[PDB]
Amino acid sequence: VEHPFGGGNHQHIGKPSTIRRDAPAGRKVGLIAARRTGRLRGT
Amino acid sequence: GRVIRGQRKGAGSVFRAHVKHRKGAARLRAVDFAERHGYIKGIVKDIIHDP
Amino acid sequence: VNVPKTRRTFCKKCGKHQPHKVTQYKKGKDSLYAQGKRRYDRKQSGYGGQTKPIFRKKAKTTKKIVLRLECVEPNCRSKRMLAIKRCKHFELGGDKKRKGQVIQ
RNA sequence: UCCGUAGCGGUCCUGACGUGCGAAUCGGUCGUCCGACCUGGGUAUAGGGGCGAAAGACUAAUCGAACCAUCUAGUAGCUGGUUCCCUCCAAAGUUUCCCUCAGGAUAGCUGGCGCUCUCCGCAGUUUUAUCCGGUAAAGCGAAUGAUUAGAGGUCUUGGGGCCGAAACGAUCUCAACCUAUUCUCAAACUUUAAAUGGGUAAGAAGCCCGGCUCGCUGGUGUGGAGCCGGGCGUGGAAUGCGAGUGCCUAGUGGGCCACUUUUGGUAAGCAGAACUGGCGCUGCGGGAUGAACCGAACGCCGGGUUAAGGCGCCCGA
RNA sequence: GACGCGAUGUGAUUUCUGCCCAGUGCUCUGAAUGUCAAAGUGAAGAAAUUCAAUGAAGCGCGGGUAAACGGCGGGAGUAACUAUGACUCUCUUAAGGUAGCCAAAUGCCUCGUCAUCUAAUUAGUGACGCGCAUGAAUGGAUGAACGAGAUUCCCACUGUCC
RNA sequence: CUCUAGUCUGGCACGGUGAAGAGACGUUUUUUCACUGACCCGGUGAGGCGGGG
RNA sequence: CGCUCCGGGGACAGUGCCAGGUGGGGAGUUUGACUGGGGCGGUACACCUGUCAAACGGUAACGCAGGUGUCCUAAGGCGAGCUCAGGGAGGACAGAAACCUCCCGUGGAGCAGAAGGGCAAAAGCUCGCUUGAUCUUGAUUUUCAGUACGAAUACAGACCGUGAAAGCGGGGCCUCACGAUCCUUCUGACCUUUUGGGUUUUAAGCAGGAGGUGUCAGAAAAGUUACCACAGGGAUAACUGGCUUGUGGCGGCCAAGCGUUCAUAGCGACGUCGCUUUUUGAUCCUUCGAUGUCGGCUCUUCCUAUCAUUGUGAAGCAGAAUUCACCAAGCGUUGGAUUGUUCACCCACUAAUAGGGAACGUGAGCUGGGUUUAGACCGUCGUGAGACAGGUUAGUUUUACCCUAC
Ligand SMILES: [Mg+2]
Ligand SMILES: [Mg+2]
Ligand SMILES: [Mg+2]
Ligand SMILES: [Mg+2]
Ligand SMILES: [Mg+2]
Ligand SMILES: [Mg+2]
Ligand SMILES: [Mg+2]
Ligand SMILES: [Mg+2]
Ligand SMILES: [Mg+2]
Ligand SMILES: [Mg+2]
Ligand SMILES: [Mg+2]
Ligand SMILES: [Mg+2]
Ligand SMILES: [Mg+2]
Ligand SMILES: [Mg+2]
Ligand SMILES: [Mg+2]
Ligand SMILES: [Mg+2]
Ligand SMILES: [Mg+2]
Ligand SMILES: [Mg+2]
Ligand SMILES: [Mg+2]
Ligand SMILES: [Mg+2]
Ligand SMILES: [Mg+2]
Ligand SMILES: [Mg+2]
Ligand SMILES: [Mg+2]
Ligand SMILES: [Mg+2]
Ligand SMILES: [Mg+2]
Ligand SMILES: [Mg+2]
Ligand SMILES: [Mg+2]
Ligand SMILES: [Mg+2]
Ligand SMILES: [Mg+2]
Ligand SMILES: [Mg+2]
Ligand SMILES: [Mg+2]
Ligand SMILES: [Mg+2]
Ligand SMILES: [Mg+2]
Ligand SMILES: [Mg+2]
Ligand SMILES: [Mg+2]
Ligand SMILES: [Mg+2]
Ligand SMILES: [Mg+2]
Ligand SMILES: [Mg+2]
Ligand SMILES: [Mg+2]
Ligand SMILES: [Mg+2]
Ligand SMILES: [Mg+2]
Ligand SMILES: [Mg+2]
Ligand SMILES: [Mg+2]
Ligand SMILES: [Mg+2]
Ligand SMILES: [Mg+2]
Ligand SMILES: [Mg+2]
Ligand SMILES: [Mg+2]
Ligand SMILES: [Mg+2]
Ligand SMILES: [Mg+2]
Ligand SMILES: [Mg+2]
Ligand SMILES: [Mg+2]
Ligand SMILES: [Mg+2]
Ligand SMILES: [Mg+2]
Ligand SMILES: [Zn+2]
């Protein structure tokens, strides 16, 4: 009820944390409009 | 569901800035004839800490 | 099933048996100005969402095949519908099967 | 940062108390006690909103959507109640349909109102005729399927041979095969085939003759059907009973038990059927007791006699 | 005003953080173009109307991304005592679980096997790994100090008990 | 399942002034370069703006 | 001297209205039924055959064995001509099995399918011609309320096919092969209306087919709740108590054998008869306006199917030790490590360390270790909320002064 990531019998997200830019408020959490999501290697 | 924490920040009244002990808006001098065609001279009085 | 493209059968306008051209009936395109379509279009307008039921629990696999029978007479040219039983495969006038031949 | 007081908090005894001091307190024991510390007052954020070092916690003893009023006497196929007497009649838990299975509609069972006749008709019954059946039984020396044993057979091919290099030759043999017999069976086998049962008939709406009509049918005023006009009453088996007919209609649509037949199950006070009778709806006599068993059904009484049961005493005999 | 603000995951230090972009997400690129509404354009028709072309974004198509969500095999033969079995073959998916670690708060079988602790241990600890169903920021391993956290043993102490 | 805030995108209107160019069958379509006067932003106590001398 | 206050943008941002995409951020709603509880599994939910089914008909169960959502331009309709399955005896290659011929052949074949019935100059096989699988009223039967749909039977009115003709045929030899209203689509008439009249498009009607509701007399529909709520139900599960005893436990009868010999000292196969309710089932009768749901501790009583002790019988009883059996429940049946345990296993003592019941005795007697709310962690599963007779940790145990009994 508090967050779209909350709930479950394990502390886990359960959905891709990368979210589109034109998402409604209350859903647009996590990594907003992300082009890539990893450890920065190189440039 | 309930309105989330990141949504609640835009309404204000709890998440507003703590600006009680701040010294003022830090900005440049306004542009005029002196600063547009020549130069003006001022003096540094003191250096203060802004919270 | 297999039916030929020609059938000598009764004609209501002639009052006699005449040869006919036999085709397969297909459903025509829905007109936008039928009364039920106009009523449906005005009911679906605005708010309220979908108003009429949308059938989803389909069970049958094949349709009933309707033959469109046409009088070959120049004066008459009268057509009618003749339904047959449900069949999965249907073909108009092809490969008239024979007896006593070799299966290969 | 450590021990530790005031302060703040609330681990354990799962102590006290638990119609308590108290709608969360008390005692001992405990955590922290210079910092993300404690605290008054002012002020801000208001209900699908706030606020949350995040327990769905807190938001005036109310929180997984506060409180007050109204819509509102919200709806409920569900639960509980539903108020005087007497008289008469009197059920159903079954068919079909329904997102139907704790409910309705429908038919059945019931009641009320009558009416048309009587002062021939009808029957939870039999007799006499005439049809229907495929259960009980029986049969497998009759079909189908299952199945036990010997016996006699030729070569109809073989499994072991053996005297033949060998020949449908000698010649034992064992099994398939054939032929008469024999043991044992069938809800989804049957030649046979009951008992009980299910239909019709047992007259006047019937027989009988004569005539007429037809566009139907035909060799044929042939056949068939429909019309008229007459004549025949011993009312054509037994027993019993007055019948026929039309509206409106409540309740019911959870049933259960027993002889016999019978399905599943090891069985069940188990589950599911058929027939009839009960209990439910019903008291009484008996079975000590008792929904269903035996007898017998009921206005208030007197006399007599019984049923089923009984007759040492309880306890009539 | 990017040494800032906003949105997430993990949770000091030390040591690491392997492989997979097939799936679902996120992001990029595009008249090189399949689908594609309204409006606009053209044609027919007496007109209502019909047909056709054009056809935005988004879906499709292609690239990137796992400290995004997540995932990370199966069967045979083979060392000349027995066995195990480095090695080989084959089936295969986007890889086939790497370093570690373990009957763990995670192991059904299970009270696993061995050692130790006891007179006796389904408890504890240390090893073994075939792991139903361990595993690397859904973080793995370790680890001083700390804990009204969970568990085992010993000394001392006692009415917990005889 | 059926909707909906928000958001992306297309059309019409507010909505003008010129230059070129590319167009399909002289109207009109659209692409680019500019202008300010609608419209928008910032600053200021609207303090020396543009040309000329 | 001047006309925007200076700059920065600018016919675009932006605003208004439509159009498409996206949109559990939010709203509303749904998430069938039967059911030896529910869920999972199945369809006994619409149909057909044989049986059940008790010789008219009808008749149930998640009763048994099965089948169906098709197939056929002929596998429909006539007419003609043949006879099938199988077997025997023969014939170059030819053999178990290719083809020809003779004889026997009551159907042992075939008729599309599941099964049943039916069928021999045929209903089967092969040919020839065909489209009665066409149009149109009514009536009837089946299911049944005696309503529909589906399927079917006799006619009647037409036009036809075939055969020389009698005749037969309006689908399949018969019993199944399928679908309302509303809407859409097609066909039919020199058809009706389209509103003050006329013409023409269009539209609405009438009549017959189709597009489909398989939950098959026909809603348009995914989950989770251990955070949960209400109306109820003992019509329905999880305790006890009942019926039953498959299973568990205990006991018999017969005696092939074991026992060096020897069935029966002590045992006992193959069979068979019982008992008990300290095992688990099966069932759902009582209880859901609540009967406190596992153990352990404590305490009392009862049972005998007797471990020891008293008295005895029998041994393959020399003594000692140990087995079998009888009368027999009077008296005993322990201290501990492990586990919440029941159970189990081990150490030690002993005379023996027997088995059980009392609402699986005993929570207003205790305790709360386990199980079984809400907080959390791990593994597996699920996209997710969450789930796990899978582990781990923390988690309020109320009242007697009433009656009886003591
Ligand atoms: Mg959410
Ligand atoms: Mg997962
Ligand atoms: Mg609209
Ligand atoms: Mg300190
Ligand atoms: Mg301190
Ligand atoms: Mg307490
Ligand atoms: Mg007290
Ligand atoms: Mg006091
Ligand atoms: Mg607000
Ligand atoms: Mg806080
Ligand atoms: Mg929670
Ligand atoms: Mg109901
Ligand atoms: Mg009731
Ligand atoms: Mg029969
Ligand atoms: Mg018999
Ligand atoms: Mg019964
Ligand atoms: Mg009665
Ligand atoms: Mg009675
Ligand atoms: Mg008695
Ligand atoms: Mg009397
Ligand atoms: Mg007596
Ligand atoms: Mg992360
Ligand atoms: Mg990684
Ligand atoms: Mg990808
Ligand atoms: Mg490994
Ligand atoms: Mg211990
Ligand atoms: Mg260990
Ligand atoms: Mg993993
Ligand atoms: Mg993990
Ligand atoms: Mg949404
Ligand atoms: Mg929702
Ligand atoms: Mg149900
Ligand atoms: Mg009968
Ligand atoms: Mg013939
Ligand atoms: Mg006819
Ligand atoms: Mg035929
Ligand atoms: Mg939970
Ligand atoms: Mg649950
Ligand atoms: Mg309730
Ligand atoms: Mg009950
Ligand atoms: Mg019970
Ligand atoms: Mg037994
Ligand atoms: Mg012997
Ligand atoms: Mg019952
Ligand atoms: Mg009670
Ligand atoms: Mg009690
Ligand atoms: Mg005894
Ligand atoms: Mg108990
Ligand atoms: Mg008690
Ligand atoms: Mg208690
Ligand atoms: Mg506990
Ligand atoms: Mg819990
Ligand atoms: Mg007192
Ligand atoms: Zn014609």
Amino acid symbol at C77? R
DSSP at A5: T
B12 touches chain A (CB under 8 A): no
Pull the structure tokens for residue C78: 């009268």
**Which of chain F's bases lie under 7 Å from a protein CB?**
1-8, 43-44, 47-49
Task: Give the method of determination.
Answer: cryo-EM
The experimental resolution of this structure, in angstroms, equals: 2.8
Write the CB contacts of C12 (distance below 8 Å, at least 6 apart in sequence). Answer: C78, C80
B16 touches chain A (CB under 8 A): no
Q: C69: exposed, middle or buried (C-beta count within 10 Å: 0-12, 13-18, 19+)?
A: buried
Alpha-carbon torsion angle A23, A27, A29, A35, nearest 10? -30
